[PDB]
Amino acid sequence: SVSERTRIKSDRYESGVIPYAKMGYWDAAYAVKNTDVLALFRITPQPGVDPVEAAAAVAGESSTATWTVVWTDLLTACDRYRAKAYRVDPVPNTTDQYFAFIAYECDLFEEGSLANLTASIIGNVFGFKAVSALRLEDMRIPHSYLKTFQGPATGVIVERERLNKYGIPLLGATVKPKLGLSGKNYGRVVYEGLKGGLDFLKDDENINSQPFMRWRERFLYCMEGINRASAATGETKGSYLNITAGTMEEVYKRAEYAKTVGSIVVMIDLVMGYTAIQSAAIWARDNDLILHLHRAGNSTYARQKNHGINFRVICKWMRMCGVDHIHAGTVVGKLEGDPLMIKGFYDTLLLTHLNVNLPYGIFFEMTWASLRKCMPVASGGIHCGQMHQLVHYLGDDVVLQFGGGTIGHPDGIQAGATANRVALEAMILARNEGADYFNSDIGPQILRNAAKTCGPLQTALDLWKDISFNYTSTDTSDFSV
Amino acid sequence: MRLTQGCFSFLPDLTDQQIEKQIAYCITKGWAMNVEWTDDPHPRNSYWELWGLPLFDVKDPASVMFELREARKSCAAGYIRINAFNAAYGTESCVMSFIVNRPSNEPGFYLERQELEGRRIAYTTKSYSVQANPEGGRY
Amino acid sequence: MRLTQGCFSFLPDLTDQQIEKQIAYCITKGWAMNVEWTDDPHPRNSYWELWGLPLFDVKDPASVMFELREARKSCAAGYIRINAFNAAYGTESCVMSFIVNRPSNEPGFYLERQELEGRRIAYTTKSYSVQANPEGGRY
Amino acid sequence: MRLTQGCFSFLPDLTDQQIEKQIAYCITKGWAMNVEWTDDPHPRNSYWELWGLPLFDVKDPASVMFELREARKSCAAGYIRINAFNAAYGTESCVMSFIVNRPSNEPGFYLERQELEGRRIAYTTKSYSVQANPEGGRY
Amino acid sequence: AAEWGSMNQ
Numbered sequence: 017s018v019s020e021r022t023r024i025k026s027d028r029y030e031s032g033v034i035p036y037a038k039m040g041y042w043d044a045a046y047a048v049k050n051t052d053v054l055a056l057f058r059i060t061p062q063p064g065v066d067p068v069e070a071a072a073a074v075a076g077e078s079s080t081a082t083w084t085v086v087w088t089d090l091l092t093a094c095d096r097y098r099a100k101a102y103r104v105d106p107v108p109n110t111t112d113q114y115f116a117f118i119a120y121e122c123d124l125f126e127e128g129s130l131a132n133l134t135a136s137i138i139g140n141v142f143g144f145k146a147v148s149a150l151r152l153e154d155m156r157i158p159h160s161y162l163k164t165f166q167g168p169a170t171g172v173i174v175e176r177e178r179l180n181k182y183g184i185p186l187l188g189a190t191v192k193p194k195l196g197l198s199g200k201n202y203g204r205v206v207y208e209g210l211k212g213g214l215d216f217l218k219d220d221e222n223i224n225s226q227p228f229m230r231w232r233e234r235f236l237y238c239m240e241g242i243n244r245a246s247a248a249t250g251e252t253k254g255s256y257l258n259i260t261a262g263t264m265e266e267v268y269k270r271a272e273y274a275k276t277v278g279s280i281v282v283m284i285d286l287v288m289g290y291t292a293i294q295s296a297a298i299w300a301r302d303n304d305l306i307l308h309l310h311r312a313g314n315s316t317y318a319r320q321k322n323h324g325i326n327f328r329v330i331c332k333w334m335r336m337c338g339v340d341h342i343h344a345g346t347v348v349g350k351l352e353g354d355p356l357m358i359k360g361f362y363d364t365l366l367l368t369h370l371n372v373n374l375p376y377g378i379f380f381e382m383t384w385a386s387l388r389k390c391m392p393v394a395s396g397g398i399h400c401g402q403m404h405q406l407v408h409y410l411g412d413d414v415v416l417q418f419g420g421g422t423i424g425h426p427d428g429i430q431a432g433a434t435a436n437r438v439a440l441e442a443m444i445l446a447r448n449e450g451a452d453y454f455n456s457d458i459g460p461q462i463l464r465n466a467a468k469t470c471g472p473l474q475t476a477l478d479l480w481k482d483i484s485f486n487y488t489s490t491d492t493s494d495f496s497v
Numbered sequence: 498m499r500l501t502q503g504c505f506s507f508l509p510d511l512t513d514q515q516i517e518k519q520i521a522y523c524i525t526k527g528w529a530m531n532v533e534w535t536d537d538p539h540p541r542n543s544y545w546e547l548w549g550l551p552l553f554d555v556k557d558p559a560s561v562m563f564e565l566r567e568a569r570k571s572c573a574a575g576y577i578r579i580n581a582f583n584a585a586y587g588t589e590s591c592v593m594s595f596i597v598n599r600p601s602n603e604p605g606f607y608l609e610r611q612e613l614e615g616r617r618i619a620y621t622t623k624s625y626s627v628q629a630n631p632e633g634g635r636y
Numbered sequence: 637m638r639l640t641q642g643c644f645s646f647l648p649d650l651t652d653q654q655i656e657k658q659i660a661y662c663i664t665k666g667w668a669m670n671v672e673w674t675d676d677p678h679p680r681n682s683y684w685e686l687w688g689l690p691l692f693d694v695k696d697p698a699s700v701m702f703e704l705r706e707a708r709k710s711c712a713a714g715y716i717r718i719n720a721f722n723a724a725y726g727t728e729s730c731v732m733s734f735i736v737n738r739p740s741n742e743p744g745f746y747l748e749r750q751e752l753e754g755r756r757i758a759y760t761t762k763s764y765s766v767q768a769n770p771e772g773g774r775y
Numbered sequence: 776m777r778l779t780q781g782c783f784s785f786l787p788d789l790t791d792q793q794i795e796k797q798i799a800y801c802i803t804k805g806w807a808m809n810v811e812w813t814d815d816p817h818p819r820n821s822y823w824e825l826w827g828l829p830l831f832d833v834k835d836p837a838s839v840m841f842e843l844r845e846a847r848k849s850c851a852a853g854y855i856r857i858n859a860f861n862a863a864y865g866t867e868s869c870v871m872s873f874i875v876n877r878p879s880n881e882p883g884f885y886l887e888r889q890e891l892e893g894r895r896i897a898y899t900t901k902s903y904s905v906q907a908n909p910e911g912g913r914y
Numbered sequence: 915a916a917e918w919g920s921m922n923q
């Protein structure tokens with residue numbers, strides 16, 4: 017027969033199954049290029065599996081390999097398209113955990129598309145039977161690839177100019193309770209909070225269009241509350257209108273309405289998806305709007321150290337898509353946050369370049385190729401009694417948000433807003449004069465001193481004095497110093 | 498009404514010693530300082546009037562204090578502000594701004610509401626001082 | 637009519653010695669060779685039938701000549717062609733193709749003209765051999 | 776060519792004992808059985824000709840075997856198929872179908888390619904038997 | 915260690 021005579025007898029291309037590390041997916045003597053995409057994975061092999069074979073399997077199944085030999089490989093420049101595992105090391109103070117470095121060719125990805133990049137890096141590797149657990153810890157995205165993405169629509173610098181606000185963190189609050197209020201009652205809270213001294217207020221992530229309140233009603237009343245407050249104070253004000261919806265057509269309809277009534281900003285949720293997010297960031301740039309991103313759902317895969325994706329990677333992907341704000345943690349609030357890991361997140365979102373810093377979880381040096389900066393947002397069970405800690409851990413480019421910490425004031429919403437602004441102003445002034453505001457004694461005294469000229473602040477300090485959330489963290493570092 | 502533009506407007510008017518300290522903090526960073534004036538406080542009024550060129554390499558707050566003293570006795574009733582600029586790659590913008598002189602009294606603003614399609618309103622913010630007198634004689 | 641697909645169709649049918657030389661030229665470059673067959677010669681008929689797998693590391697034209705000899709005595713009346721592939725980065729495609737066997741007679745094709753909007757025509761090219769008999773018995 | 780419609784066309788023609796067993800499997804489920812015929816085997820030819828009404832409450836394959844025997848000696852050369860229907864809420868559709876009689880020879884089909892805008896082609900699949908003779912005399 | 919900065923030029 018012709019078929020039998022034309023059978024491949026080459027050692028590498030004869031039919032059958034061979035190890036991934038003998039298929040060309042492991043290369044300890046590999047030289048990395050400045051155009052290559054790189055990834056760091058924390059792998060846990062099944063009892064009996066060789067650490068190097070596991071790394072080679074992850075590299076092959078995330079590039080061009082399958083479980084058995086295929087001759088069709090000879091119709092392509094195979095060596096150029098194969099990903100290569102090049103370094104494997106044990107995780108310190110651990111047995112059965114190893115770190116693995118992998119390099120990918122630039123031509124494997126579609127320009128400007130996050131769905132495509134993720135389809136390769138996280139497509140099916142996490143479900144492989146030969147591994148018991150797996151976690152993507154970091155990535156190095158090259159200058160060449162960064163240039164095919166838009167980056168933030170507004171950016172921190174242009175945004176401060178749009179608000180005429182410079183040299184201090186911005187302030188905000190969420191409307192409470194989460195659900196149940198009508199459009200007219202929603203506008204009343206916005207008017208009150210802004211008038212007391214907040215820069216912005218926001219709808220809860222779960223507020224969209226429901227039987228108790230339809231969206232068009234909420235948008236109209238909110239613009240009346242914003243204009244009233246701005247005319248009474250002489251400042252630019254705003255509220256995050258939520259445009260999250262079930263279909264792309266409905267999203268666009270809500271974005272075009274908010275622009276028509278003159279909103280300076282709008283907000284979206286992470287549950288919408290990468291493709292919907294990319295479309296929204298392109299629209300905001302073409303229509304002069306600020307875009308806020310709520311990270312609903314992130315903790316389903318970013319909480320445990322043994323399996324999933326580390327938040328610092330999500331930070332990079334979202335800065336590439338082009339969002340203007342993103343929730344990043346508080347350290348002292350009611351949600352999870354280790355101080356060393358959080359400092360790493362803030363740096364990834366605000367710096368022009370990153371240098372290796374193991375104790376902070378920074379594994380790769382990386383430049384941002386002049387992409388604009390993304391503003392971090394701190395929210396979740398925090399109060400004016402903790403002002404000294406917030407200034408020391410979060411920095412100056414950040415939005416501090418107080419929901420229960422404002423509406424829960426006994427003397428009204430306007431009183432709550434005033435207590436928060438005064439506390440901040442006094443702390444920054446003291447800092448700029450060279451005081452040790454972080455000391456457990458200096459910090460509180462500074463607030464106490466300011467309180468003797470502001471009744472609202474005195475009331476708040478006495479109310480939430482002994483309030484704290486101390487619990488062991490889940491996601492921690494693997495290095496020290 | 499008290500105009501709440503600036504970073505320290507929820508605190509009492511600052512003393513000269515207080516102002517000097519904030520200036521000393523900006524120069525320790527290497528920032529450039531300048532002084533501006535206006536009698537139109539609309540929140541979208543971006544360009545205030547410049548008082549001379551910015552002080553780029555001055556390394557002593559006394560030089561900044563002197564210039565502010567002159568403007569105070571030279572300019573008409575209105576508002577004065579001090580700004581700090583950072584020309585570092587990645588910023589190239591202002592990084593601080595605070596008010597340092599106010600008029601005896603400020604009446605404030607009111608809203609005008611033009612009705613357009615459906616229930617939509619087009620809003621306009623109006624100043625009492627501006628609508629009443631020309632520049633130079635508003636306060 | 638003579639079908640003019642291929643690079644040497646304006647020359648007489650090539651001898652076996654001529655064919656061997658062209659093969660020797662492709663292997664000196666390091667190209668992979670294969671043989672195909674069909675009885676439908678429409679110019680948009682991209683996929684001819686494959687005769688075994690491509691000969692990747694064969695370094696002697698005699699191996700290619702043998703395979704062509706077999707097809708000649710095994711396949712039905714129709715057309716046979718030899719192709720050469722280059723898998724180098726920047727190419728990864730075919731780089732040569734020529735006919736090496738023809739039917740005793742080829743009637744050719746005719747055009748059908750469907751009239752659509754205004755003066756536009758939608759054309760269809762039709763083969764006499766195909767329309768008359770099923771595959772295997774067209775020539 | 777062999778027509779590959781049906782669930783067992785990659786196996787040899789089934790014997791009468793083989794057919795009876797498959798019928799016995801469908802009745803154990805409570806399904807309704809029917810027999811159809813056609814001389815046009817286009818893959819989009821959905822409605823074959825019906826041979827009587829479906830056998831709804833027959834509980835013995837011998838009844839189905841008898842009907843198939845009649846069609847075989849009564850119908851013209853062509854194709855015969857047996858189908859099983861399930862009227863349960865959630866289904867209400869056919870759940871099995873296989874060929875049980877073929878013509879002595881099937882020439883097959885060929886493709887016609889109309890060229891439209893850009894590089895687009897509109898394809899049409901054509902049968903040799905249909906184009907040559909009217910229904911009743913195609914095989 | 916410090917070989918991670920030299921292995922990834």
Ligand SMILES: O=C(O)[C@@](O)(COP(=O)(O)O)[C@H](O)[C@H](O)COP(=O)(O)O
Nearest residue numbers: 190311343351395396397417418419420
């Ligand atoms: O729904 C809530 O719980 C919040 O409005 C908190 O309001 P409170 O101020 O009343 O606590 C925020 O969405 C969370 O901070 C989100 O968490 P994160 O920022 O970590 O994504």
